[PDB]
């Protein structure tokens, strides 16, 4: 039978093609993860159907109900067979699903509006004229909260008390705030997103400094899945063949708009 | 059970403490992977014995006999329970042992003698005064031989025919050749090693450019091992808690000899 792939609309991983209403099935979608799914399927010998996660979420477990949402929930509750998306390999997720080795690396990075005189986290930590913050939940916030590194501790002590609030409800809000704050806001977010947005019109943002931590996206399957061993080997094979890097260059740089 | 850990003497992962002759067991050794082992064991609730792999090898399958050597051989043939070492996660290895998610990221990188006017692989590819090569038989050479990327193919066309030969028998030789060629040799090698040597006296080398590929070191267990799940979760936990970054900084930079640039 056909493998049900769960994935999520997040550019440039999975995007509606311009004329998606004229198309059907897998042909509606394009992107890094669309291309990656086709290569995984080809290397594992399976037919598949791409579906967009019903609740539009990656995967978190409610602290009160213990219920998983997003793509992880679609795996553990038996709605999909594999998630092929920019889903971070994390301890809490790894406990309930199987992950391939990472297909893309990333880490926390700084996004400024071009012109802003900030080149690093240390620069941010030393000043307050340019506000800076993180998404209001999730791991980037938690990274600062728990850090024992002096620079990041200084940054957390500032962020947690800063007024007006430097936290944002969505990544989209973080990026809009950089763009609409006239050089007075910098936003801490995933390097992959930062690099992507740097290549998008209106070309007014840029990534600065090194990453502050390290993590990876993986393909996820249920524990015991008849697909999991072959999917992981296929990720390694695609990495070694230069295909993962080719796809990253294609979707971030070849299709870039900013020179 | 005492868990048998196979590992390898490679600086700064596992090194002999200077007073090692008076010490015994795990106390003989220090380094990033010694610290990592201790953290893994704590977080999995096991006792362990570090043992240095007898043949001093990481793990490859002999072309003729098809027998695995090194640490991978120790796992495959039933001699050790876990390998805690800078063992790159590769397809051929993943087929025969289990790996944790990577505890350290790395990629092919360029080492120059300070003052060499080279900032990237593209720079190397566009000139002929400065020679450059790789280890003579391993994955970095193969990366170039197999590449369809125009810059790397241009580099491979050059290297395979360069005279005198630009390939070296050992990593130590490649580093020495950088140091002793007055800026006329650059060497392509793992970024982790490149970073480490940049922190070694006489402080005459540096890493330049982005990495040319991405790979990771993993903890390995025999396939189907009952320890694998706990070990993997411990690697992710140690990552999220910042411990892996703390160990890398400690062994590369805190204990570095060349300052911060």
Curated annotation (Swiss-Prot), chain B:
Which residues are marked as site: Interaction with the cone snail toxin Con-ikot-ikot?
61, 145, 237
Protein name in the entry: Glutamate receptor 2
Q: In which tissues is it expressed?
A: Detected in forebrain. Detected in dendrites of neuronal cells. Expressed in the pyramidal cell layers of CA1 and CA3 and in the granule cell layer of the dentate gyrus.
Covered residues, full protein: 414 to 797 of 883
Entry superkingdom: Eukaryota
PTM-bearing positions, type Phosphoserine: 147, 181
SS bonds (residue pairs): 203-258
What is the gene called? Gria2
Cited function: Ionotropic glutamate receptor that functions as a ligand-gated cation channel, gated by L-glutamate and glutamatergic agonists such as alpha-amino-3-hydroxy-5-methyl-4-isoxazolepropionic acid (AMPA), quisqualic acid, and kainic acid. L-glutamate acts as an excitatory neurotransmitter at many synapses in the central nervous system and plays an important role in fast excitatory synaptic transmission.
Cite the domain annotation text. Answer: The M4 transmembrane segment mediates tetramerization and is required for cell surface expression.
The protein's PTM annotation reads: Palmitoylated. Depalmitoylated upon L-glutamate stimulation. Ubiquitinated by RNF167, leading to its degradation.
Q: Which organism is it from?
A: Rattus norvegicus (Rat)
